[PDB]
Amino acid sequence: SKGRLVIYCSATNVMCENAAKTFEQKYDVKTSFIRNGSGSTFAKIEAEKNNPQADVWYGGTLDPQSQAGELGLLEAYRSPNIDQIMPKFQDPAKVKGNLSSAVYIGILGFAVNTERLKKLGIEKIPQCWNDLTDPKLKGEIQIADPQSSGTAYTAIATFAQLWGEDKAFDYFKHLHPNISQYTKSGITPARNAARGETTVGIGFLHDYALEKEQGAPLEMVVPCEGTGYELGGVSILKGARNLDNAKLFVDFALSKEGQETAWKKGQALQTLTNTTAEQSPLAFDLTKLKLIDYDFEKYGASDERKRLINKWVDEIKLA
Ligand SMILES: O=P(O)(O)OC[C@H]1O[C@](O)(CO)[C@@H](O)[C@@H]1O
């Protein structure tokens, strides 16, 4: 066993486990992970900043990792594999120097349980963000909570960029009566839509694509007004105990093999950032989508992330 590695993972358990096992088997490193939301994981790393408990932060959305970079929580390391990453996303965070790197892309949207829709007596599948404010969807939608979930923050930032911040919060307020719960995890609305516990889930479409691929009666929607996206992040923690192995993990996560195994074995259907990697047949093609130019440098920062989340809690979660 060539050393150890502790991962804070913010992707799904199945993806994290497959990455940790594939790394351990490829490189003989004793690898373990702890899984938590992108926002939850940031708070934990910030809290542990004097005596870091993990070596790398893998998966989840980029914005909290960018914020961690800004706050001095990360250790800069540019993997030679960055040369293979889509040039647009080679060094995308607020603070340059690859404190954080982009390992995948996820499209924000929603999906609809077409069988439950029918039971609600609704015949039209919603096609726009605006449709989700219709009163007939009372208690029939779920979205995550940005206090824990990177997905929820990606949505907030997407809406602020689309409509302007004030209209974004107006949207949250009109959406609110249709939300049955603000979920801790970004993926929970996908799971509950798949279950038919809810009719509409808002989140990253590859999660819905996997439920669909496994039989769920879901129709995925890229909303007609346009939408944003996540970059999945990988970052080394400042003070990492196993630095060398952390660098090796970053290499692997940015590698053709490390990215392909996410969809080949890890049941994770994000679009890959390594231009030499084979994409899943179910991965979204960004060139075909109505996407805003999501400003990672701007929203992966405290003056947006802490401000908007605290504002979201004040005006939406409370009143
Ligand atoms: O919203 P959360 O809980 O931080 O999780 C975000 C992550 O969940 C996923 O959608 C799971 O596939 C990831 O692509 C994304 O990075």
Numbering used by the authors: 0 to 318
What do the study authors state?
In this study, we investigate AfuABC (Actinobacillus ferric uptake ABC), a BPDT originally identified as an iron-specific transporter in Actinobacillus pleuropneumoniae, a Gram-negative upper respiratory tract pathogen. Instead, AfuABC is a trio of proteins that bind and transport sugar-phosphates such as glucose-6-phosphate (G6P).
A subsequent ligand screen by ITC with structurally similar molecules revealed that three other sugar-phosphates including fructose-6-phosphate (F6P), sedoheptulose-7-phosphate (S7P) and M6P had affinities of 8, 57 and 960 nM respectively for AfuA. Structures of AfuA bound to F6P (2.0Å) and S7P (1.3Å) were also solved to confirm ligand coordination. Similar to the G6P structure, both F6P and S7P were found in the β-anomer conformation. Between the three holo-AfuA structures, strand and amino acid placement and conformation were identical (RMSD < 0.4Å between Cα chains). F6P binding affinities of the single site AfuA mutants displayed the same trend as for G6P, suggesting a similar binding mechanism between the two ligands. On the opposing end of the pocket, redundant phosphate-coordinating residues such as Ser37 cooperate to hold the phosphate moiety of ligands.
